[PDB]
Design a protein around this nucleic acid. Structure first.
Length: 69
RNA sequence: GGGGCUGUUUACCAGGUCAGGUCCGAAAGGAAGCAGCCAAGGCAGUUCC
């Protein structure tokens, strides 16, 4: 369950923009996503890092769940 | 070394374009610009000087 899937699945049109600013690698192996990259993404989608941290927060919750079934 | 070609590689760190999203504006409209792509670079092979 990489970000690509999580992507498929008004405040959404705001979350999509955030993934549309990543790179296939990022969307494939998120752990690699740290400081510097986050700064790129947020600014890349008129967001802020908190917004990004949240989405990633959302994905984590979403992933962990599936990693449990 | 340089030119050409081919394969491969490269988040951001003054290339171009810029979906999506963002900024400013009552509007008309401007502004910046990620991913992508292109270009460019890196690592090689080949060929020409």
């Amino acid at each position: 369950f990489d970000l690509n899937d999580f992507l498929e699945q008004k405040v959404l049109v705001r979350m999509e923009a955030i993934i549309n600013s990543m790179t296939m690698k990022e969307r494939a192996k998120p752990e690699i996503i740290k400081g510097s990259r986050k700064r790129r993404i947020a600014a890349g989608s008129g967001m802020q890092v908190q917004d990004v941290n949240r989405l990633l927060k959302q994905f984590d919750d979403m992933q962990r769940m599936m990693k449990k079934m």
